[PDB]
Amino acid sequence: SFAQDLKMKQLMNWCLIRALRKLEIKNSQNKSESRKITLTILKDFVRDIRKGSHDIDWXXXXXXXXXXXXXXXXXXXXXXXXXXXXXXXXXXXXXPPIKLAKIPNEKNIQNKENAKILEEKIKTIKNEIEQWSKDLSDVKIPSYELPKLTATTKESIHSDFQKRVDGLQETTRLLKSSSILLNETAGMKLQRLNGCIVKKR
Amino acid sequence: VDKLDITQKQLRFLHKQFKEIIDEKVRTALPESSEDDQVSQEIQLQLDQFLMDVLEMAGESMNVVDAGKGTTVKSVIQEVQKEYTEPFDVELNEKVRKLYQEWEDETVKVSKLRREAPQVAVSEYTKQENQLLEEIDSLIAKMDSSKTQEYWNQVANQYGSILTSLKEINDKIPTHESKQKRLRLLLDLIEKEVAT
Amino acid sequence: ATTPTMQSTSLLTEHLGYPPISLVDDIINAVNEIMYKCTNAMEKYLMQRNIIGKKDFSDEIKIGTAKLESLLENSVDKNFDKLELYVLRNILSIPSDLLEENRFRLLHHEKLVLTDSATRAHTDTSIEQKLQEIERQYQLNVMLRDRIQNTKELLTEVVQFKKKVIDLLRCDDNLTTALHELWDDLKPLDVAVKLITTRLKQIYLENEEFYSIDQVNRLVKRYNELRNTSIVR
Amino acid sequence: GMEGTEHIRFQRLVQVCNKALEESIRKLQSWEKIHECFPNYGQTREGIENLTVCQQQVIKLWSNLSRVEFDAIFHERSIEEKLNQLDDLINKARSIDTSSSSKKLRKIDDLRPLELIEGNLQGAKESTLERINNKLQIIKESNEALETNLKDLNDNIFQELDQLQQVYDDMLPDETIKQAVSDMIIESRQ
Numbered sequence: 034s035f036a037q038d039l040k041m042k043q044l045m046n047w048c049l050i051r052a053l054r055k056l057e058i059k060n061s062q063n064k065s066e067s068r069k070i071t072l073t074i075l076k077d078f079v080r081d082i083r084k085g086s087h088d089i090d091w092x093x094x095x096x097x098x099x100x101x102x103x104x105x106x107x108x109x110x111x112x113x114x115x116x117x118x119x120x121x122x123x124x125x126x127x128x129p130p131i132k133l134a135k136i137p138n139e140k141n142i143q144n145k146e147n148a149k150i151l152e153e154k155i156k157t158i159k160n161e162i163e164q165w166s167k168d169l170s171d172v173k174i175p176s177y178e179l180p181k182l183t184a185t186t187k188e189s190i191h192s193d194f195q196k197r198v199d200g201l202q203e204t205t206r207l208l209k210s211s212s213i214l215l216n217e218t219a220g221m222k223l224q225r226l227n228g229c230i231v232k233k234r
Numbered sequence: 235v236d237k238l239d240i241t242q243k244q245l246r247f248l249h250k251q252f253k254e255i256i257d258e259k260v261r262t263a264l265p266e267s268s269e270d271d272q273v274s275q276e277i278q279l280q281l282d283q284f285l286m287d288v289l290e291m292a293g294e295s296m297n298v299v300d301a302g303k304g305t306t307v308k309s310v311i312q313e314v315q316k317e318y319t320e321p322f323d324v325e326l327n328e329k330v331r332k333l334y335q336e337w338e339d340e341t342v343k344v345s346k347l348r349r350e351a352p353q354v355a356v357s358e359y360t361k362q363e364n365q366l367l368e369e370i371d372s373l374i375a376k377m378d379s380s381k382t383q384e385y386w387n388q389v390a391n392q393y394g395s396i397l398t399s400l401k402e403i404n405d406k407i408p409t410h411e412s413k414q415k416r417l418r419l420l421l422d423l424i425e426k427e428v429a430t
Numbered sequence: 431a432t433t434p435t436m437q438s439t440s441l442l443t444e445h446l447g448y449p450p451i452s453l454v455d456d457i458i459n460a461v462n463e464i465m466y467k468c469t470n471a472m473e474k475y476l477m478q479r480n481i482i483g484k485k486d487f488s489d490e491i492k493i494g495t496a497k498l499e500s501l502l503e504n505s506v507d508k509n510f511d512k513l514e515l516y517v518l519r520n521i522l523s524i525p526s527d528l529l530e531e532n533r534f535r536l537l538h539h540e541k542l543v544l545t546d547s548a549t550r551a552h553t554d555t556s557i558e559q560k561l562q563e564i565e566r567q568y569q570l571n572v573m574l575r576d577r578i579q580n581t582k583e584l585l586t587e588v589v590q591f592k593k594k595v596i597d598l599l600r601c602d603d604n605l606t607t608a609l610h611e612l613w614d615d616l617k618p619l620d621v622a623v624k625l626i627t628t629r630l631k632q633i634y635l636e637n638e639e640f641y642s643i644d645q646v647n648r649l650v651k652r653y654n655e656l657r658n659t660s661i662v663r
Numbered sequence: 664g665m666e667g668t669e670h671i672r673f674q675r676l677v678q679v680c681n682k683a684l685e686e687s688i689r690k691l692q693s694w695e696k697i698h699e700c701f702p703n704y705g706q707t708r709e710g711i712e713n714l715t716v717c718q719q720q721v722i723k724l725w726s727n728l729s730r731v732e733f734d735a736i737f738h739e740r741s742i743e744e745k746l747n748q749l750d751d752l753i754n755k756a757r758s759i760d761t762s763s764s765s766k767k768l769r770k771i772d773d774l775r776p777l778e779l780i781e782g783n784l785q786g787a788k789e790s791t792l793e794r795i796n797n798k799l800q801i802i803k804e805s806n807e808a809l810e811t812n813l814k815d816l817n818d819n820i821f822q823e824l825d826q827l828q829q830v831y832d833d834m835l836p837d838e839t840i841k842q843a844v845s846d847m848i849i850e851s852r853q
Binding site for chain 4: 355359360364374
């Protein structure tokens, strides 16, 4: 069974292998330089591990300030707390505790981006609205639209009929008068041709 | 099976020295200037969740001896995680909500403008600028709309006068023939001297 | 090319009146609201069930609350991620065919556009011609009034004039020329005037065989002056 | 005639929504997960009675009020009309019009704060032109008709008159008789 240091690096370095690999199948989107980069750092990382980087396994650190409800201490004499090595000729409490290099988050980024997005979008929108109101009240252009017997008469027919009656009437007067003057002629002729005889016998 | 016993301090120690190395190198492929958006910082995250995958996978063929089996391992990976960052910056997230609801509202506004504004403009014209039907239908509404006797008797008396002339000349055309005959006989009797 | 998806989101954001994401967000926020209300309400309304007889179980409930909570928060969150993916992809998606063809349009678009210059100029123009033609046709209607009145006027005038000429000339009168029909029994006036005229001509010959006032009166007084008889029984 | 029967889409929305819900409840109608979340208190008899009536309670209430919330949203958005109109519009655009428009424009917006307005105006005024031309065309028709009748009865005037004129012309030696009456008048008298 055991709980050994080598087998820890067997299993762990194995998980690192599989992790790299999976992340290489996930590197189908190569144009993301983040991907190529991260892969370089992680390959050189697993290499620098398998070929040593510094002291590694087991031990702890210092714990600094505690944080446990199970914190309860009780001891006695027999070797006090003063702890460190010594003896060997040639070659300190040993306290290099934890060290941190904090990294920002992700929601900060999504909120930066989304902020930019909503700023430019809402800008374009409110400006579109400007164009609407102004063009409406202005260039509406009221569509303006604004509009703007022959040769016949009583006297003519009565003049025709009267003309006929007058011409005819005049011709008639000419015939009748001709007969009158005629019988006045014959009249005379006989007035002097009726006294020649008288009569006598 | 295989069985690697862990203590919280062991696994957290390994994690923290991994982060030590990763920090050491990320500090050679780039200077310290942080905050870069889709670049640099995306790498940091990708490496975090990378260690999530690595260590989670590790706990499958490996157990803990502090609580029950491989329980809490992810809670301490995630407690050292939170020991970094992700303070949900309330103010920026508040800006996110403000500008998101503002985005929705302004959107609805431009929509109801794109329709309501043209349609109401054209409605107002089409309604007033149809007053041609005052003129036109005024029109089409209108298009549907629902002593001489003396003189006569005088020309008549002229006709009757001509008729009189007719009868008179007809009675006087025989008489003058007869009196003719008489006077021509007489004229032939003067040459003969009209005696006894 | 802008983006056919952006085009579908503009045409749909306009049609709907609200962004598509707004709907799915209302769905999510709603459900998760029921998740929180029902979580702290399961907890709350179960606090009265903590004691079971003698001992206290008030220390073994919040683990179930927290765990079940996170579990169904992630589960539901992802399930409705697949929802919204299905909504914005199948339901609220438009085929790129239509967007490319220029064939997809909205209710707004009883509208028809083009080279605005053409339709505006030709429109205003044509309309104006129509208006002036309206004016013309109206004035022409007035002319129709004129010729209607003229028409009927000539109706009465003619009817009265002719039933006059026949209630006058034909001797078929009401007041004047009834007289007698003997005058008109020889209805052709022409032949009459011809006959009398020509016979009168012949007479005018029978006298124009001269010997006029002087010839005849002198012939007479000559005769008488040549003396005769006086007196006899 | 209103293709696709309007629906086909809102129905699917209901489908996916309710299926995602019920397939998200799977963990509440399976008490094993409760055995995981309550190893000890879940084994208690009274406790598991409580969590039984309470699990049933949450399925029932959850499902009900969730549904009425979905319906409420559908009312908030009148999504029925929007989607039915969406499908309808799509298929009409599939089976209507083709050639009228020579070349086309982008339907997002070239710059369409105006193009929309001016478009609507110009179309509406096209309709105007149409009806106006129609009512005019009517005035022309009625006009030419009345002209037809008036000119008919006018030619009936001229015809009638001219006729009866030549009629009484058919019913009704000036010189030689002038010289006759002259020569005869030459005689004088006392």
